[PDB]
Design a protein around this ligand. Structure first.
Ligand SMILES: C[C@@H](C(=O)N1CCC(=O)N(C)CC1)N1CC[C@H](NS(=O)(=O)c2ccc3cc(Cl)ccc3c2)C1=O
Ligand SMILES: [Ca+2]
Lengths: 234, 52
């Protein structure tokens, strides 16, 4: 996350971190329930074997709220394509259930019509992660969050060098130097409604980070709610 | 602006229009309150809530 603020105690409890064989974070995820994590399909090609860490706000200290979970089943959308990042979504079923506590809680899955008419029409959403704090730097050891305005669909298509499909949406800023960045992929885009946070997007891709005339591109969760529901039942 | 377009039909969470009237509902792990509008967490760590 470029710009934004540190997630303070309990503020981003649905954040999940995918960590490789060497215990380094490489992608984010969103806690959906005690057994399931939502992430980006493109993150699945970033490591051979991986685990999921929850409750971690600082990757340098061992507090006692952090827990590592092994993945039992990886459910990748069958239409995911490397070429365009269309269908950039996956659901992970964990081997053991997540214990909810301070800094560990699920985000809510909204109903489709209501999310489209009420959540995605809000001014802003919130993206979070342990990704780079600058386009060329290293991963953040602190969890960060950033308020990102929803971008007009016409504007986004005009700004982009690549196709923005109906499974994607844009958020962020035209020139203001704030955006998600490398390593934030797969993490949560949530929208607040009456002090309740609903999953609305998955951090997917961008033409660099916080570049002038460019926005962040997110997987449109509302297009996959039935898919997600089906994935969490088997 | 009428029904669900009017301040979310006064619903805490999901709003639907059925037969010209508002019907509120809630996310999994919440129960609809007696007033049929508010959503009450069924147990600890309800989805979508910042912790403490
Ligand atoms: C265009 C896209 C790319 O090469 N691909 C792969 C193929 C392609 O051409 N597509 C359009 C799909 C995306 N790329 C190029 C660089 C960039 N990588 S990144 O690590 O800086 C990155 C990753 C995720 C991001 C998410 C948000 Cl919301 C904002 C910025 C991000 C920056 C990146 O993602
Ligand atoms: Ca820690």
């Amino acid at each position: 996350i470029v710009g934004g603020q540190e997630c303070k105690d309990g503020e981003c409890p649905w954040q999940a971190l995918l960590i490789n064989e060497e215990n380094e974070g490489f992608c984010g995820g969103t806690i959906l329930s005690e057994f399931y994590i939502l992430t980006a399909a493109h993150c699945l090609y970033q490591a051979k074997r991986f685990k999921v860490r929850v409750g971690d706000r600082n990757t340098e200290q061992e507090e006692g709220g952090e827990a590592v979970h092994e993945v039992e089943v990886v459910i990748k959308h069958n239409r995911f394509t490397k070429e365009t990042y269309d269908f950039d979504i996956a659901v992970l079923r964990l081997k053991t259930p997540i214990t909810f506590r301070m800094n560990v809680a699920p985000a809510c899955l909204p109903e489709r019509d209501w999310a489209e008419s009420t959540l995605m029409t809000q001014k802003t959403g919130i993206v979070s992660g342990f990704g780079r704090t600058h386009e060329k730097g290293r991963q953040s050891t602190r969890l960060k969050m950033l308020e990102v305005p929803y971008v007009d669909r016409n504007s986004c298509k005009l700004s982009s060098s690549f196709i923005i499909t109906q499974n994607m949406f844009c958020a962020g800023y035209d020139t203001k130097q704030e955006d998600a960045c490398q390593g934030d992929s797969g993490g949560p885009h949530v929208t607040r409604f009456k002090d309740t946070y609903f999953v609305t997007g998955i951090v997917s891709w961008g033409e660099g980070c916080a570049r002038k005339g460019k926005y962040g591109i997110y997987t449109k969760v509302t297009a996959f709610l039935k898919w997600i529901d089906r994935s969490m039942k088997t | 602006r009428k029904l669900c377009s009017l301040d979310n039909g006064d619903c805490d969470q999901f709003c639907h229009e059925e037969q010209n009237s508002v019907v509120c509902s809630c996310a999994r792990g919440y129960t609809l309150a007696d007033n049929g509008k508010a959503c009450i967490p069924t147990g600890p760590y309800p989805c979508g809530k910042q912790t403490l």
